[PDB]
Nucleic acid binder design. Structure first.
Lengths: 141, 181, 35, 99, 185, 50
RNA sequence: CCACCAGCCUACCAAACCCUGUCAAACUCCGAAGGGUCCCAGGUGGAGCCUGGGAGUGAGGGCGCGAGCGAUAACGUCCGCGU
RNA sequence: AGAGCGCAAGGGUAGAAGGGGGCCUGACUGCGAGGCCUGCAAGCCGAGCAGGGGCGAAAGCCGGGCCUAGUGAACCGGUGGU
RNA sequence: UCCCCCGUGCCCAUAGCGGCGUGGAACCACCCGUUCCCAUUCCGAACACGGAAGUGAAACGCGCCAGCGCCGAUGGUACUGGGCGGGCGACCGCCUGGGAGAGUAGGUCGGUGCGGGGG
């Protein structure tokens, strides 16, 4: 999960999400990696879920890194209200992730390990992903 | 010109030892004296008027001058005095005047002090300067018990054209500053 | 030191407890101390 | 450090750009814009006298003549650290009308 | 190692890429023309290369000259190379990134521990006269929490450097497990 | 606010006016400022009325 | 483990700097498309300018992309350029 | 220039608007070219003229405050004058 | 015409930092006296009035070095007028014109007009 604990605005307007990754598809960290496929928010709920399922499966495992960060406020309105009158609320604390972005990466593992790990992990995630090695990624800072 | 005991010795004694050991083949680069300012900034001027500066003016009185009540800067809510107009007793000494200051200093002011072990050899700025403090005001000659209230030490500040430790140090020792050890 | 209300100067001595006879030039005419 | 452009409080109209320095006194009257000068007068950088305050007087007045020959009326004493101890040449009698 | 090269004309890259030739640029000192290579064997040879090894480009211009890489822009969308820059080679103290082969399996390693792969490729100013192949890094005695950096690496007698040097090239980090359910708190 | 309130200034030498404000709270006793009336040049001006 | 006061260490907490990547409507070193305006030029059209009589009009709707809001739901509501 | 510049933020500012001292009192009069803005109304900006006035060695500034909030058309009348 | 320096303006960091070297014969600067003009909330520091001996460190001017700083092409890509499909939408493609920053190559410690004095 994790997030800023008091950042700036309790509410910010959802947004239009097209594509470009903005940058962040290479490495310098993990040997194996998971890259997003569809332009979307990914919940810190799903985020710590992947975190779990992953470290979960490979116990005693090495370190896993997250380049990304869930810094977006969902504006949630109360259940069965009526329109207008206000706005949503600081719920659903998620990250903006567009295709190409490396959500997360592993190192110290095995081949098959990193495979199955990132496999189930990304399976959890609210979309689909790509499993990747570490080669052409060489250089981009 | 106001020839005191240490100024004349400065003229003579400095050029030998300094130029001979240290070596300075530049008539004017040779880093000698500079501004010697004295400062006694308390924080007790919460108020007590300039009846509290009155005891601060008696200080410049002893050096033979009149001072400047420079002050604070900020709003300390803890030990009072916001804004910044309390006590920061400050006066500047140059050439001849500075000379008689250090005269009274190491001729008679030094002797006294009860914990006068030896001048602090660690209080160097490293840029040809030398700051230090002290416990008693009356340590200086011209002030005896008749005025004192309790405690009023000072913060002697001194600058030199000097830039390193040894030059200013042995300068002080060719101008009578017996250090610790 | 300029001005006009300056507490002046004038020479002073030092009749120490040893017999020292030092010649100074500060604020107070009759100075004499310890060593 | 006395920039401030006192020269900007002198961007008003027409200039007298100078500087006082130990020995010589560099009194110049200057058409600005293109920074095209005109009327200069100095201490012994003019081969006149060796005393700055004396020179001043004479020089300002000498300078006056030069100015008035080229059809010159008014400017403004240009210097930041000028302080105005006058040098009561003060380039005032010295053609300008001055002050 | 060997690879083909062809001079670019100025046709819009859309066509170039749409075919099967990767469009790229080369230069040295003041020269700055445009070129292109052929993906598959280029992708292949580049695996074995990057800025770590050295490229040769034979060219149907009666000249066959070599380069090293530099700055490879990608597609973002769908991940893959689309453009490369190639700096021509010389003899004068060139700055680039030499691979750091990690040798050793000490106390951090063995007793758990994961290496910090920070700087495989490090900034050194080695004269193109010489070609350092694979700089050795002495990991033969490190513990978790302790690192390796600076001059600790191999400076091959014909290789200088000018990074920091304080820059941690590698280090050891602790493993995780169900003890993160403890942190779950 | 009426603490700074609102008063006006008349000349001596018979009448005249000009529009002003005050500040009784601040060390403001009375005022003999120096302005200009409708007639002649600059002169006295005395403080008065609401 | 000492005092005139310090050392010393860790799979610790963390001010700062350095690197490693990074997010951004109310951040902005740079900065497009474009839009704005005046100058020269064309352009003859139910153009345009000036005054004068008479109006109607002021719940609009849809689609298009740009943004809010809703839940990146509504044959949803709210604006904008566009039709 | 991250300080300060009353007060919220934004713009801006150390070639000053910030901070210290001296004389003062242009929160001036009679006017106002020509512009902002705009349905009306009201609001914003101002060279110069002229009286005379403060300061300035001069050049010169001055129709309050670094600027944007601190505001209420008319009808009723209070009060001084013409 | 030009050489050095001083008074100066203009370009607005490729002009700045710093490290270094070098000049005082006219200068500039420190220096020098603080009686005279004058001032410091304290200081002849600062501003000063008057000035011989010295000096070229510190001030500065001119040079050398890119280490820091700043500039940054050329290719490509972002994104976008206008036109046109494809997707349930989230969104994606294509043509024509426009065309960034990121950084790689490299570049850079300076450009310049008025007046004055010495040769």
């Amino acid at each position: 999960m994790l997030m800023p604990r008091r950042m700036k605005y309790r509410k910010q307007q959802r947004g239009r999400l097209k594509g470009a990754t903005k940058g962040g598809d290479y490495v310098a960290f993990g040997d194996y990696g998971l890259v997003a496929l569809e332009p979307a928010w990914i919940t810190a709920q799903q985020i710590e879920a992947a975190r779990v399922a992953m470290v979960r499966h490979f116990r005693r495992g090495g370190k896993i890194f997250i380049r990304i960060f869930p810094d977006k406020p969902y504006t949630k309105k109360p259940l069965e209200v009526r329109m207008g009158k206000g706005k949503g609320n600081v719920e659903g604390y998620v990250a903006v992730v567009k295709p190409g972005r490396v959500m997360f990466e592993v190192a110290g593992v095995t081949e098959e390990q990193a495979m199955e790990a990132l496999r189930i992990a990304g399976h959890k995630l609210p979309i689909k992903t790509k499993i990747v090695r570490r080669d052409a990624y060489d250089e981009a800072q | 010109p106001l020839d005191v005991a240490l100024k004349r010795k400065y003229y003579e004694e400095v050029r030998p030892e300094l130029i001979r050991r240290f070596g300075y083949q530049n008539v004017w680069e040779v880093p000698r004296l500079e501004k010697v300012v004295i400062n006694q900034g308390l924080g007790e001027a919460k108020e007590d008027a300039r009846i509290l500066e009155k005891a601060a003016q008696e200080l410049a009185l002893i050096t033979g001058q009149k001072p400047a009540v420079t002050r604070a800067k900020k709003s300390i809510s803890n030990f009072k005095l916001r804004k910044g107009m309390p006590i920061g007793l400050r006066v500047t000494l140059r050439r001849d005047r500075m000379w008689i200051f250090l005269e009274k200093l190491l001729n008679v002011a030094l002797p006294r002090i009860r914990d006068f072990r030896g001048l602090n050899p660690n209080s160097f700025d490293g840029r040809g300067n030398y700051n230090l403090g002290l416990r008693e005001q009356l340590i200086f000659p011209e002030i005896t018990y008749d005025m004192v209230d309790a405690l009023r030490g000072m913060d002697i500040a001194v600058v030199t054209t000097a830039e390193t430790d040894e030059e200013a140090r042995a300068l002080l020792e060719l101008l009578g500053f017996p250090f610790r050890k | 030191m300029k001005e006009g209300i300056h507490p002046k100067l004038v020479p002073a001595r030092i009749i120490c407890g040893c017999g020292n006879v030092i010649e100074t030039y500060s604020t107070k005419p009759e100075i004499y101390v310890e060593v | 450090k006395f920039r401030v452009r006192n020269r900007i409080k002198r961007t008003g109209r027409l200039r007298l750009s100078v500087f006082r320095s130990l020995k010589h006194i560099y009194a110049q009257i200057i058409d600005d814009e293109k920074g095209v000068t005109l009327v200069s007068a100095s201490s012994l950088a003019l081969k006149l006298k060796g005393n700055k305050t004396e020179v001043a007087r004479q020089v300002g007045r000498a300078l006056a003549e030069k100015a008035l020959a080229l059809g010159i009326k008014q400017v403004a004493f240009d210097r930041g650290p000028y302080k105005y101890h006058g040098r009561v040449k003060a380039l005032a009698e010295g053609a300008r009308e001055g002050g | 190692y060997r690879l083909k090269a062809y001079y670019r004309e100025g046709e819009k890259p859309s066509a170039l890429r749409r075919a099967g030739k990767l469009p790229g640029v080369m230069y040295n000192r003041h020269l700055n023309r445009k070129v292109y290579v052929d993906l598959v064997e280029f992708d292949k040879v580049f695996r074995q290369a990057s800025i770590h090894h050295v490229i040769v480009l034979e060219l149907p211009d009666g000249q066959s000259l070599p380069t090293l890489v530099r700055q490879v822009n990608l597609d973002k969308r769908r991940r893959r190379p689309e453009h490369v820059d190639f700096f021509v080679l010389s003899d004068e103290p060139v700055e680039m990134y030499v691979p750091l082969r990690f040798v050793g399996t000490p106390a951090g390693v063995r007793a758990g521990g994961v290496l910090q792969e920070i700087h495989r490729d490090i900034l050194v100013k080695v004269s193109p006269r010489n070609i350092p192949e694979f700089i050795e890094v002495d990991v033969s005695g490190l513990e978790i929490g302790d690192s390796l950096h600076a001059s600790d690496l191999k400076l091959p007698p014909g290789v200088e450097l000018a990074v920091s040097p304080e820059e941690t090239i590698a280090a050891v980090v602790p493993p995780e497990d169900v003890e993160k359910l403890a942190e779950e708190a | 606010v009426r603490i700074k309130l609102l008063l006006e200034c008349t000349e001596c030498k018979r009448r005249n006016y000009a529009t002003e404000k005050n500040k009784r709270n601040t060390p403001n006793k009375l005022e003999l400022r120096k302005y200009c009336p409708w007639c002649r040049k600059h002169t006295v001006h005395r403080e008065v009325k609401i």
